[PDB]
Design a protein around this ligand. Structure first.
Ligand SMILES: Nc1ncnc2c1ncn2[C@@H]1O[C@H](CSCC[C@H](N)C(=O)O)[C@@H](O)[C@H]1O
Ligand SMILES: Nc1ncnc2c1ncn2[C@@H]1O[C@H](CSCC[C@H](N)C(=O)O)[C@@H](O)[C@H]1O
Ligand SMILES: Nc1ncnc2c1ncn2[C@@H]1O[C@H](CSCC[C@H](N)C(=O)O)[C@@H](O)[C@H]1O
Ligand SMILES: Nc1ncnc2c1ncn2[C@@H]1O[C@H](CSCC[C@H](N)C(=O)O)[C@@H](O)[C@H]1O
Lengths: 219, 208, 219, 208
């Protein structure tokens, strides 16, 4: 092969990124300046408001959440801001999404965490409702925390989303889900979520119509 | 003319729609020589809704027709069908379309080149080409012609034209395309199959 | 695999591009607006003055050069502007460079030629002086034209460069080489080039200290 | 402490420099557990130029020392050597360095963590760490620490310090690094091996 940054090899195994359209966007969380490649004006991944909210919550509740060495999975990670912040806070982070997102997700993770966080993040395809037992078998993959931000949108496969949330929530797992409430379907999803998860409203961000929920699975 | 691309990997695949047993020559070496999940769902819809749609004698254009199953089904149902794709796809498209429609549908279907967003005014002038329906299946995926695709869909959508678009949803970009489609078309979800991640939409061009 | 633009699969097989540093630069040659990803301020490939000069020559001498269906190889192609222009003019273009250049080279070629030129360009590693018989055997790879722009720079392996130029110049092959004359080593290389190639000065670009040479191999 | 990374793929590789037969434990699973072409060329240079360089009792730091061949050779030649790398590389680096220098060179070499550009003021204060030579081999390649690398080279280059840097040239970025190195160091090409694409430079920090 070529003598390159070894992390770049995993990047080469994802769908390529249409980078002409992507620009460097700057954030600051958990004491660090963060740079995210996003495609704001054309096709490609972007940071959503739910991410901004969840990142604020994580930086502010870091001591309580005890992310140091926690095993974390993010569903619908997008460009990766939340997974980056979780990694800065010391978690073992697996960031997941659809195949066209994974390259830029991995790139963003590398650019913000390589040799400067406790654990190198992992990037993996996870299509909601598909191949869960095959790729994320409960018996081999317990997560202390499952993160999700702005994964509820009317055109997504939302029962597959709920099924995935449930699948990844074992006894002890804490699910942190932030969303902007844009449409009636979002409200309807919250009612479905509350039926199966013991649900707590942790924070409200009225300025962005974002709410942050904790879900632990009812026994 | 059109001659099929000379693949050594052609297979004869067997389908049944609108009451006819249909054979489609396919090759995995080209997306356009493969029947995709959107095609199956759209064929099932056309077969089940033929009465409502009044395809009898309707003028229809299919974009990205690939191996031609949807165009065959539309011809079987009595439409005047124009099947379009990239120049290299046309040979096998015409072969399949003719094998399945010659002397057995109401109207012989036509095959024409239509590269998305290229020379639409010159190749398909509105002064002479009006479609009652535009059909599209599995044309949205992670490729570099998404804007040109939407432009083409808009172009072919004169007032009165109905667009029927089926697609498997695979990529973040597919959802972005859907959002852009809804900005320009009054959109109705006709059917959804979460197991196969397929949606089928009607689009009517917005004027307001 | 994934249902993606099929050209993107070849892109995934090259060293990844550090795209945060790359910006879209605009050129106009051979009647077309061209967009090139370049890394001007940091590590990554850029367009050199020799490219600008050679592109001007190609657009202006298109009829004479008869690039339609010509088999062309570019050595040290960089971000790919020259190979793009050659492809627009109708040539079968093989663009070559060191492994860290090939991804962005291929990307630039795709963004400017996919479904809009006569022949899809090829991208291949070609390290000067290495693996020539193995990867570009004269008996299977005859080129009508070999292109090179600003490939002469003092810190490169310039005898390996000359050896490569010679290797790729069969009877009938026309070598078009543009360079800015920056250093004494550049002048010295020109003297070496003239010793082995029948050399003609085709054009001088005094405004950028660029000269464009034709070389045909002495028999 | 430092313990070698637990690879199942360690091999015992055999070198001869400065008159000693040297054994280096290597693993292809880490760049830092492999001897690279720059190392060989730099060792050959140090062996051939030892008289001129007055390494006897010289204080020397190696950055990116990897499996430690260059540091071993420098110790053999009588220098006080500090070998540095990433924390995961240090175990095998110390193992090799000790196996080859314990009770048989003038000065026992030291192994210390030095992640390029990280906490240099805190970990290697100038108030207490002056190197007569800084050594580096094959530390330039297509990685995301090139600026930090150069910063580190500059940091360790106090007035009087000589930097010796050997490298295989593989990538366009390697040449860009060389251009940036020459902006900040008065640079001399000590040796060049086109067949193996290796160059060896001396750098002295510029003040003018
Ligand atoms: N069925 C599915 N499987 C996996 N991911 C999906 C999905 N449907 C949508 N997604 C992903 O969910 C994300 C929603 S957008 C939110 C992105 C990110 N969490 C942020 O807040 O910035 C997108 O990245 C999208 O690709
Ligand atoms: N830029 C472009 N212009 C015209 N057709 C294109 C195109 N890009 C892709 N296509 C065509 O779109 C099709 C996508 S695959 C879908 C084929 C068929 N509709 C089915 O569902 O089975 C291929 O036939 C491909 O050749
Ligand atoms: N030994 C070698 N083998 C292959 N390419 C080399 C090389 N040494 C340098 N190069 C390449 O030669 C190019 C010189 S810069 C010129 C780039 C381009 N032709 C333009 O004019 O814009 C770089 O892309 C560099 O990576
Ligand atoms: N950011 C960083 N800080 C410190 N060392 C680094 C580094 N990035 C890479 N390295 C080290 O640089 C070395 C490059 S390989 C060269 C090893 C040795 N000098 C030889 O020539 O054989 C590896 O040991 C690697 O661990």
């Amino acid at each position: 092969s070529n003598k390159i940054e070894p992390s770049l090899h995993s990047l080469q195994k994802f769908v390529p990124t249409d980078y002409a359209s992507y620009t460097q966007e700057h954030y600051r969380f958990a004491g660090k300046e963060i740079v995210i490649q996003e495609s704001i004006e054309s096709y490609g991944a972007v940071v959503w408001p739910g991410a901004m909210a969840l990142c604020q919550y994580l930086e502010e509740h870091a001591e309580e959440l005890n992310f140091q060495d926690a095993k974390i999975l993010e569903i619908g990670a997008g460009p990766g801001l939340v997974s980056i912040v979780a990694s800065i806070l010391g978690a073992q982070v697996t960031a997941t999404d659809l195949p066209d997102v994974l390259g830029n997700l991995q790139y963003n993770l590398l650019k913000n965490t390589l040799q400067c966080t406790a654990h190198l993040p992992e990037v993996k395809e996870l299509v909601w409702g598909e191949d869960l037992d095959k790729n994320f078998p409960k018996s081999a993959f317990y997560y202390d925390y499952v993160l999700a931000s702005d994964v509820v949108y009317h055109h997504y496969f939302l029962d597959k989303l709920l099924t995935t949330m449930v699948y990844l929530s074992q006894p002890g797992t804490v699910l942190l889900w932030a969303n902007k409430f844009r449409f009636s379907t979002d409200y309807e999803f919250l009612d479905k979520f509350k039926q199966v998860f013991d649900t707590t409203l942790l924070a409200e961000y009225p300025e962005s119509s974002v709410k942050l929920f904790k879900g632990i699975l009812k026994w």
